[PDB]
C-alpha cells in the first residue's frame, strides 16, 4: 500500500506468535523492539540513536510479518522508546520512499 | 523519484544558504540538523529517542529545499549525530512509503 506521512507510520506486526505495533522507520538501519522474550540464542550488541548508545540483544533469522508481508531477519531487543521496523526488514517487504 | 532502502536514504538539501546531505527519516516528525550557525530567533527544545535526549535550538519558518522540492517549516539545530529530515517536511514534498 501507499502510506502518507501526516501521521506516524504505525503498523501491526506478528513476531514470536504475538501481535504488536511498530513504526516504519527509514531512519533506522535495524529493527529494534521494546523488551520482550524471543526464542533462540541472542548476542550482546550496542547501537546508536539520537540521544546516544544503548545495549541490546541481537536475535538472528527471526520471522516477522509486517502488514501481511513476510520477512525473516535480525531483530534487536532493548530500551528503545518505541518498536521500530528498520531498513534491514523494510527492504525485505519491498518498501521504498517516493516523491 | 524512488529511493530504495538498501542503504541509508541520503539526499541533498539546501538550507540557510548551504547544501548538505540529509537522511529521509519517517521515524521522526521533527527535522534535525547538525550544528550550524543560522541567523534569527529560536527557542530551546529537548528531543529524545534511542540513547536518550539532546538539547537543540528550534528555528521556525525556515526554507528548506529537498532534491529540488521546496519546503518550509521548523528545523531543530543541535548535536545530532546526523542530519535528519522528518515527516514535517516529508509531507510538504509529497513523500510516501510504498510496498
Amino acid at each position: 500500500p501507499q502510506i502518507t506521512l501526516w501521521k506516524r507510520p504505525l503498523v501491526t506486526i506478528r513476531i514470536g506468535g504475538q501481535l504488536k505495533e511498530a513504526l516504519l522507520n527509514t531512519g533506522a538501519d535495524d529493527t529494534v523492539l521494546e523488551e520482550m522474550n524471543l526464542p533462540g540464542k541472542w548476542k550482546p550488541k550496542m547501537i546508536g540513536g539520537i540521544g546516544g548508545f544503548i545495549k541490546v540483544r541481537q536475535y538472528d533469522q527471526i520471522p516477522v510479518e509486517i502488514c501481511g508481508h513476510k520477512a525473516i531477519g535480525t531483530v534487536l531487543v532493548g530500551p528503545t522508546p518505541a518498536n521500530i521496523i528498520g531498513r534491514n526488514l523494510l527492504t525485505q517487504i519491498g518498501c521504498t520512499l517516493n516523491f | 523519484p524512488q529511493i530504495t532502502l538498501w542503504k541509508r536514504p541520503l539526499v541533498t538539501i539546501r538550507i540557510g544558504g548551504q547544501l548538505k546531505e540529509a537522511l529521509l527519516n519517517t521515524g521522526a516528525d521533527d527535522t534535525v540538523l547538525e550544528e550550524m550557525n543560522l541567523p534569527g530567533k529560536w527557542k530551546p527544545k529537548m528531543i529524545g529517542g534511542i540513547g536518550g535526549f539532546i538539547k537543540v535550538r528550534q528555528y521556525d519558518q525556515i526554507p528548506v529545499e529537498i532534491c529540488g522540492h521546496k519546503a518550509i517549516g521548523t528545523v531543530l539545530v543541535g548535536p545530532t549525530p546526523a542530519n535528519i529530515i522528518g515527516r514535517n517536511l516529508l509531507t510538504q514534498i509529497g513523500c510516501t512509503l510504498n510496498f
Binding site: 531512519g27 533506522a28 539520537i50 | 541509508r8 537522511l23 535528519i84
Partner: peptide
C-alpha cells in the same frame, strides 16, 4: 555503529 533515528 548501527544508527537508528526514531524521535518521540
Amino acid at each position: 555503529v548501527s544508527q537508528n533515528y526514531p524521535i518521540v
